[model samples]
Target: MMNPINRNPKQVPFAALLPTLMNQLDKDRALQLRTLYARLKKNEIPKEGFTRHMKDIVGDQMLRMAVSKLQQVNY
Candidate 1:
């Protein structure tokens, strides 16, 4: 059996998701992401709230893809 040693199972690998996200964002959505990143870096938003804000911008479909990419990196 493979031992997966990651501590945070729900962690998003932001670097991995960044390029794809950049391509999909409109100007206002881009600003929202920038704001979100600032807050995230400052630990202002919890995971649930971050997810909510992102989904509001990018919607469930792209969000799912980003989550899937996070899983792949963890795997």
Candidate 2:
């Protein structure tokens, strides 16, 4: 399991985390959330934000916010 402090990429809420989460998360996971968010909202999050692979510029914040919420799905 990834360190809780490092944060996971599944439990974070998908709200208006733009510009804020970007300030908290890393470039790798930021790309993850961007691609995910793009799939869900393409026009709103166009390809203009990403380049050179995980080069996040827009969805960075959203991912960070989400990662902060990740946790083991203990059931």
**Each model's C-alpha lDDT?**
0.75, 0.47
- Per-residue CA lDDT of model 1 for 1-75, tens digit only, reads 498676755665775565567567887887888788778778899878876887888888998877776577646
What lDDT does candidate 1 reach at residue 20?
64
Give the clash count for each candidate. 0, 3
Sliding window of 10 residues with minimal summed lDDT for model 1: 8-17
Instruction: State how far residue 35 of model 2 sits from its true place (Å).
Output: 0.5
- What are the root-mean-square deviations of the candidates from the true structure over C-alphas? 4.8, 11.2
Clashes of 1: 0
lDDT for position 38 in model 2: 69
The TM-score that candidate 2 achieves is: 0.33
lDDT of 2 by residue, 1-75 (tens): 475556444543444453345455577756665665665465544444322232344344534434454433442
